[PDB]
């Protein structure tokens, strides 16, 4: 094989380029802001309930219930962890495909960013968009009450603010019901997360 | 900078590291040069709780750098960013009182090099028997030429689409005064 | 001034700070050349584009020295050392190997061409939207509030210079959603109510400019028994004092 | 030949994934950090936030 050229160098170069591009894509998507904001300890925003999307401190990995359901729905084969040669030599009389792939020179590399860092980025983005609105995306974050921000948004879509200020409770209840229905809709559908499963 | 190096055995337990190996060279492990990451076993680097921006990626949230501490190679966990916490209240607001004009740059590629390949010269050169033998192998070279010509035309098409928005050649006035703006 | 009005700031803010804005723009433009020169790896994409083609051509040339299982990599030696009916099986291997090399090169070139075409389409869209007009899309023509842009040409590429507006020097204030007066609720037309500690004014969004609360910049459209957090004060009618 | 086929398929899939990631990044920048007026870009109806 030594006298057949340098095809394998090209193969290695292409694989390394793809591997670097994956991490580049993840960094471009999930690293918009460079400040780690924190939500206030008191959770009151004029009647709006954000408990279903905020991180849960009770569990060790600090993930929201929706993120928990999303992570439990998708089944992963190999996560790039240490599939130790000891595990393959354990000889439990159940030879999986991972050991067969490993014994023939095929390996899987772990991603640069862990799930905890992505969760931290998501939490920072959520806190920034809740406590400041759209100000933190163009400069320093400026505090503003949430109902006033939603009135600004209604003015943006073309509705006066008195419409919001006279129907605050109804809007809050509708938002809470719509958020609550999301988990049931995701759980009931069996093929909701088909794209990631196809990718795997 | 330096000739110091560090070794990473990928997907290998640090206890199972070999110390007859295929590579003749070997690195000897001291008390503090051995570290275990979810990507394998690292030899030749020192681990600290000092957190900085990533310099050389290694594995799952672990980076390496060359630091003066005597210069050496250190390994650490990458930092996401600076900590912040904005005060929130339902009867308070923040309003800016000044502004700043900023200028930023962005670079975007447009086209690349146009190349052409001659089959007979590359494969057979001046030989006639080789050309006669190649003549009965089909019409792959026609497809190669067609693809190369298509790429060459597409490059010029991209350049024209990018840089030919307007069809009028305007000229700047001879007097350069725009209310104090310097262009 | 039209552009500042587009981003949501009144024209008198520009017309009263023309010299400062001009000086800031001049300094920002002057810093660009130093920033570009100091950074060694600023123009990495175009250099990568050149280097990829150079490396591909070099590899294609280097591939000609392989044997591909034959007795030699030179056709003349095979022709002069072997039986003409026997030398064909040696030439076939070389032909097949060189054909495979050409196929690999062409496929790689096609993929790179597709990527370059996507990049060029993005660049053309940016040229159309950021230079020929003012864009309201967030983070499309720079960071901040877009004002305008300048194009420049570079080897195999384009460079965009975006000018943006960034707020600074913020201050805390006390705010209310509406103002109660004579049993009627008043909401601001544009801006927000602000309290400095004793009195109440109305200001705009991105710049501090307090104004006396008046019926000219407020509308009633409601009552004073349903808004949560209302604060009652006095609303001044302009015409009444001068009659 | 098997290795070449695998590498080519991987490259094509990588290009598709990169396009999808670019679209996702644009959606993150435009729908979450601000209010979008583009029709059917951040949902169906009149966009409020994300
Ligand atoms: C926001 O919504 C959540 C979800 O409905 C509420 O959590 C529920 O609270 C009730 C009352 O304490 C419990 O009986 C439920 O078991 C809780 N559900 C879950 C999933 O934990 C939460 O109370 C709401 N927030 C507020 C301020 O009312
Ligand atoms: C808004 O910012 C500008 C820029 O920093 C301030 O202008 C500076 O003012 C100080 C004090 O008079 C001068 O020493 C600087 O030379 C000015 N800089 C420039 C570039 O002219 C301006 O004062 C700020 N506005 C307010 C109200 O403080
Ligand atoms: C616009 O800026 C340029 C660059 O600073 C100015 O050119 C400088 O002018 C001074 C005064 O004549 C010279 O001492 C410098 O050597 C010039 N710099 C360069 C790079 O040539 C130019 O004068 C400015 N325009 C105006 C109207 O003041
Ligand atoms: C809030 O704004 C009001 C209105 O400008 C301030 O009242 C002024 O105070 C100055 C200084 O004492 C007087 O010279 C003016 O005559 C006052 N104006 C009026 C209409 O009474 C008030 O001082 C501001 N609050 C604070 C804490 O500075
Ligand atoms: C390495 O081997 C030791 C042996 O006891 C084991 O306890 C440890 O879990 C192993 N680590 C990994 C990452 O496999
Ligand atoms: C690094 O930080 C951990 C976490 O507190 C601590 O237990 C450990 O002793 C630190 N190591 C050094 C060398 O300071
Ligand atoms: C929000 O308003 C309520 C009034 O019900 C008040 O008790 C609470 O203190 C306010 N929030 C803050 C952070 O002051
Ligand atoms: C506004 O008040 C908060 C809390 O008192 C403080 O952290 C913040 O720095 C203040 N803003 C300014 C501009 O001083
Ligand atoms: C004005 O506001 C104060 C403070 O809440 C309130 O006590 C008073 O009754 C209000 N005035 C009228 C006429 O309702």
Short mmCIF file of N, CA and C in Angstrom, two decimals, chain C residues 48-138:
data_model
loop_
_atom_site.label_atom_id
_atom_site.label_comp_id
_atom_site.label_asym_id
_atom_site.label_seq_id
_atom_site.Cartn_x
_atom_site.Cartn_y
_atom_site.Cartn_z
N UNK C 48 -6.64 31.36 3.01
CA UNK C 48 -7.03 29.96 2.98
C UNK C 48 -7.52 29.55 1.60
N UNK C 49 -8.28 30.43 0.94
CA UNK C 49 -8.77 30.15 -0.41
C UNK C 49 -7.60 29.94 -1.36
N UNK C 50 -6.59 30.80 -1.28
CA UNK C 50 -5.42 30.65 -2.15
C UNK C 50 -4.66 29.36 -1.81
N UNK C 51 -4.46 29.10 -0.51
CA UNK C 51 -3.64 27.98 -0.09
C UNK C 51 -4.28 26.65 -0.45
N UNK C 52 -5.61 26.56 -0.40
CA UNK C 52 -6.27 25.31 -0.75
C UNK C 52 -6.01 24.94 -2.20
N UNK C 53 -6.15 25.91 -3.11
CA UNK C 53 -5.88 25.66 -4.52
C UNK C 53 -4.41 25.31 -4.74
N UNK C 54 -3.50 26.03 -4.09
CA UNK C 54 -2.08 25.74 -4.25
C UNK C 54 -1.76 24.32 -3.80
N UNK C 55 -2.28 23.92 -2.64
CA UNK C 55 -2.03 22.58 -2.12
C UNK C 55 -2.64 21.51 -3.01
N UNK C 56 -3.84 21.75 -3.53
CA UNK C 56 -4.47 20.77 -4.42
C UNK C 56 -3.64 20.57 -5.68
N UNK C 57 -3.18 21.67 -6.29
CA UNK C 57 -2.36 21.54 -7.49
C UNK C 57 -1.03 20.84 -7.19
N UNK C 58 -0.42 21.16 -6.05
CA UNK C 58 0.84 20.52 -5.69
C UNK C 58 0.65 19.02 -5.47
N UNK C 59 -0.44 18.63 -4.81
CA UNK C 59 -0.72 17.21 -4.61
C UNK C 59 -0.97 16.50 -5.93
N UNK C 60 -1.71 17.14 -6.84
CA UNK C 60 -1.96 16.55 -8.14
C UNK C 60 -0.66 16.33 -8.91
N UNK C 61 0.26 17.29 -8.83
CA UNK C 61 1.55 17.13 -9.50
C UNK C 61 2.36 16.02 -8.83
N UNK C 62 2.38 15.99 -7.50
CA UNK C 62 3.17 14.99 -6.78
C UNK C 62 2.66 13.58 -7.02
N UNK C 63 1.37 13.42 -7.31
CA UNK C 63 0.80 12.09 -7.50
C UNK C 63 1.37 11.35 -8.71
N UNK C 64 2.09 12.04 -9.60
CA UNK C 64 2.59 11.41 -10.82
C UNK C 64 3.77 10.48 -10.58
N UNK C 65 4.33 10.44 -9.37
CA UNK C 65 5.50 9.63 -9.08
C UNK C 65 5.16 8.28 -8.47
N UNK C 66 3.88 7.92 -8.42
CA UNK C 66 3.46 6.65 -7.85
C UNK C 66 3.56 5.53 -8.89
N UNK C 67 3.73 4.30 -8.40
CA UNK C 67 3.85 3.14 -9.26
C UNK C 67 2.53 2.40 -9.48
N UNK C 68 1.63 2.42 -8.49
CA UNK C 68 0.32 1.78 -8.59
C UNK C 68 0.45 0.29 -8.90
N UNK C 69 1.48 -0.35 -8.34
CA UNK C 69 1.68 -1.77 -8.49
C UNK C 69 2.45 -2.19 -9.72
N UNK C 70 2.87 -1.26 -10.57
CA UNK C 70 3.64 -1.59 -11.76
C UNK C 70 5.12 -1.69 -11.41
N UNK C 71 5.94 -1.98 -12.43
CA UNK C 71 7.37 -2.11 -12.21
C UNK C 71 8.08 -0.76 -12.22
N UNK C 72 7.47 0.27 -12.78
CA UNK C 72 8.09 1.59 -12.84
C UNK C 72 7.00 2.63 -13.03
N UNK C 73 7.34 3.88 -12.71
CA UNK C 73 6.43 5.01 -12.86
C UNK C 73 6.71 5.81 -14.13
N UNK C 74 7.63 5.35 -14.97
CA UNK C 74 7.99 6.02 -16.22
C UNK C 74 7.55 5.14 -17.38
N UNK C 75 6.80 5.73 -18.32
CA UNK C 75 6.30 4.96 -19.45
C UNK C 75 7.42 4.55 -20.40
N UNK C 76 8.44 5.40 -20.56
CA UNK C 76 9.52 5.10 -21.49
C UNK C 76 10.30 3.86 -21.06
N UNK C 77 10.56 3.73 -19.75
CA UNK C 77 11.27 2.56 -19.26
C UNK C 77 10.48 1.28 -19.51
N UNK C 78 9.17 1.32 -19.26
CA UNK C 78 8.32 0.16 -19.51
C UNK C 78 8.32 -0.19 -21.00
N UNK C 79 8.22 0.83 -21.85
CA UNK C 79 8.19 0.59 -23.29
C UNK C 79 9.50 0.00 -23.79
N UNK C 80 10.63 0.47 -23.26
CA UNK C 80 11.94 0.02 -23.72
C UNK C 80 12.41 -1.26 -23.04
N UNK C 81 11.75 -1.70 -21.97
CA UNK C 81 12.20 -2.87 -21.23
C UNK C 81 11.28 -4.08 -21.34
N UNK C 82 10.13 -3.96 -21.99
CA UNK C 82 9.12 -5.01 -21.95
C UNK C 82 8.58 -5.31 -23.34
N UNK C 83 7.97 -6.48 -23.45
CA UNK C 83 7.34 -6.91 -24.69
C UNK C 83 6.14 -6.01 -24.98
N UNK C 84 5.98 -5.52 -26.21
CA UNK C 84 4.84 -4.64 -26.52
C UNK C 84 3.49 -5.28 -26.19
N UNK C 85 3.29 -6.58 -26.46
CA UNK C 85 2.04 -7.21 -26.00
C UNK C 85 1.97 -7.40 -24.49
N UNK C 86 3.08 -7.26 -23.78
CA UNK C 86 3.11 -7.42 -22.33
C UNK C 86 3.11 -6.10 -21.58
N UNK C 87 3.62 -5.03 -22.19
CA UNK C 87 3.70 -3.74 -21.51
C UNK C 87 2.34 -3.10 -21.29
N UNK C 88 1.28 -3.60 -21.93
CA UNK C 88 -0.04 -2.98 -21.79
C UNK C 88 -0.58 -3.14 -20.37
N UNK C 89 -0.37 -4.31 -19.76
CA UNK C 89 -0.87 -4.54 -18.41
C UNK C 89 -0.18 -3.65 -17.39
N UNK C 90 1.00 -3.12 -17.72
CA UNK C 90 1.67 -2.18 -16.83
C UNK C 90 1.16 -0.76 -17.03
N UNK C 91 0.86 -0.39 -18.28
CA UNK C 91 0.33 0.94 -18.56
C UNK C 91 -1.08 1.09 -18.02
N UNK C 92 -1.85 -0.01 -17.98
CA UNK C 92 -3.23 0.06 -17.52
C UNK C 92 -3.31 0.53 -16.07
N UNK C 93 -2.42 0.04 -15.22
CA UNK C 93 -2.44 0.42 -13.81
C UNK C 93 -2.17 1.91 -13.64
N UNK C 94 -1.17 2.43 -14.36
CA UNK C 94 -0.86 3.85 -14.30
C UNK C 94 -2.04 4.69 -14.78
N UNK C 95 -2.67 4.26 -15.88
CA UNK C 95 -3.81 5.01 -16.41
C UNK C 95 -4.94 5.05 -15.39
N UNK C 96 -5.24 3.90 -14.77
CA UNK C 96 -6.32 3.85 -13.79
C UNK C 96 -6.01 4.74 -12.59
N UNK C 97 -4.78 4.69 -12.09
CA UNK C 97 -4.42 5.52 -10.94
C UNK C 97 -4.53 7.00 -11.24
N UNK C 98 -4.03 7.42 -12.40
CA UNK C 98 -4.10 8.84 -12.76
C UNK C 98 -5.55 9.28 -12.97
N UNK C 99 -6.37 8.40 -13.55
CA UNK C 99 -7.79 8.72 -13.70
C UNK C 99 -8.46 8.91 -12.35
N UNK C 100 -8.16 8.03 -11.39
CA UNK C 100 -8.73 8.17 -10.05
C UNK C 100 -8.29 9.47 -9.40
N UNK C 101 -7.02 9.84 -9.56
CA UNK C 101 -6.54 11.11 -9.01
C UNK C 101 -7.30 12.29 -9.61
N UNK C 102 -7.51 12.26 -10.93
CA UNK C 102 -8.25 13.34 -11.58
C UNK C 102 -9.69 13.41 -11.07
N UNK C 103 -10.33 12.26 -10.90
CA UNK C 103 -11.71 12.25 -10.39
C UNK C 103 -11.78 12.86 -8.99
N UNK C 104 -10.85 12.48 -8.12
CA UNK C 104 -10.84 13.04 -6.77
C UNK C 104 -10.66 14.55 -6.80
N UNK C 105 -9.71 15.03 -7.62
CA UNK C 105 -9.48 16.47 -7.72
C UNK C 105 -10.73 17.20 -8.20
N UNK C 106 -11.40 16.65 -9.21
CA UNK C 106 -12.58 17.31 -9.77
C UNK C 106 -13.71 17.36 -8.74
N UNK C 107 -13.92 16.27 -8.00
CA UNK C 107 -14.97 16.27 -6.98
C UNK C 107 -14.70 17.30 -5.89
N UNK C 108 -13.45 17.37 -5.42
CA UNK C 108 -13.11 18.36 -4.40
C UNK C 108 -13.33 19.78 -4.93
N UNK C 109 -12.94 20.02 -6.19
CA UNK C 109 -13.14 21.34 -6.78
C UNK C 109 -14.62 21.70 -6.86
N UNK C 110 -15.46 20.73 -7.22
CA UNK C 110 -16.90 21.00 -7.31
C UNK C 110 -17.47 21.37 -5.95
N UNK C 111 -17.09 20.64 -4.90
CA UNK C 111 -17.60 20.95 -3.56
C UNK C 111 -17.16 22.35 -3.13
N UNK C 112 -15.88 22.67 -3.34
CA UNK C 112 -15.39 23.99 -2.98
C UNK C 112 -16.10 25.08 -3.77
N UNK C 113 -16.40 24.82 -5.04
CA UNK C 113 -17.11 25.79 -5.86
C UNK C 113 -18.51 26.04 -5.32
N UNK C 114 -19.20 24.99 -4.87
CA UNK C 114 -20.52 25.18 -4.28
C UNK C 114 -20.44 26.05 -3.03
N UNK C 115 -19.46 25.78 -2.16
CA UNK C 115 -19.31 26.60 -0.96
C UNK C 115 -19.02 28.06 -1.31
N UNK C 116 -18.15 28.29 -2.30
CA UNK C 116 -17.80 29.65 -2.70
C UNK C 116 -19.02 30.36 -3.28
N UNK C 117 -19.85 29.63 -4.03
CA UNK C 117 -21.06 30.23 -4.59
C UNK C 117 -22.02 30.66 -3.49
N UNK C 118 -22.17 29.83 -2.45
CA UNK C 118 -23.01 30.22 -1.32
C UNK C 118 -22.48 31.49 -0.66
N UNK C 119 -21.16 31.55 -0.44
CA UNK C 119 -20.57 32.74 0.17
C UNK C 119 -20.79 33.97 -0.69
N UNK C 120 -20.65 33.83 -2.01
CA UNK C 120 -20.84 34.96 -2.91
C UNK C 120 -22.28 35.44 -2.91
N UNK C 121 -23.24 34.51 -2.84
CA UNK C 121 -24.64 34.91 -2.75
C UNK C 121 -24.90 35.70 -1.47
N UNK C 122 -24.34 35.24 -0.35
CA UNK C 122 -24.49 35.99 0.90
C UNK C 122 -23.88 37.38 0.78
N UNK C 123 -22.70 37.48 0.16
CA UNK C 123 -22.05 38.77 0.00
C UNK C 123 -22.87 39.71 -0.88
N UNK C 124 -23.48 39.18 -1.94
CA UNK C 124 -24.32 40.00 -2.81
C UNK C 124 -25.55 40.50 -2.06
N UNK C 125 -26.17 39.64 -1.26
CA UNK C 125 -27.31 40.08 -0.46
C UNK C 125 -26.91 41.18 0.52
N UNK C 126 -25.75 41.02 1.17
CA UNK C 126 -25.28 42.05 2.09
C UNK C 126 -25.00 43.36 1.36
N UNK C 127 -24.41 43.29 0.17
CA UNK C 127 -24.20 44.49 -0.64
C UNK C 127 -25.52 45.18 -0.95
N UNK C 128 -26.54 44.40 -1.32
CA UNK C 128 -27.82 45.00 -1.71
C UNK C 128 -28.53 45.62 -0.52
N UNK C 129 -28.44 45.00 0.66
CA UNK C 129 -29.26 45.42 1.79
C UNK C 129 -28.59 46.39 2.74
N UNK C 130 -27.26 46.33 2.91
CA UNK C 130 -26.60 47.19 3.88
C UNK C 130 -26.04 48.46 3.26
N UNK C 131 -25.67 48.43 1.98
CA UNK C 131 -25.03 49.59 1.35
C UNK C 131 -26.05 50.46 0.63
N UNK C 132 -27.00 49.86 -0.09
CA UNK C 132 -27.99 50.62 -0.84
C UNK C 132 -29.17 51.06 0.01
N UNK C 133 -29.20 50.72 1.29
CA UNK C 133 -30.29 51.12 2.15
C UNK C 133 -29.94 50.92 3.61
N UNK C 134 -30.93 51.19 4.46
CA UNK C 134 -30.79 51.03 5.90
C UNK C 134 -31.56 49.79 6.34
N UNK C 135 -30.87 48.89 7.03
CA UNK C 135 -31.44 47.61 7.42
C UNK C 135 -31.86 47.63 8.88
N UNK C 136 -33.03 47.06 9.16
CA UNK C 136 -33.54 46.92 10.52
C UNK C 136 -33.32 45.53 11.09
N UNK C 137 -32.73 44.61 10.32
CA UNK C 137 -32.44 43.28 10.83
C UNK C 137 -31.32 43.34 11.85
N UNK C 138 -31.49 42.60 12.95
CA UNK C 138 -30.54 42.64 14.05
C UNK C 138 -29.29 41.87 13.68
#
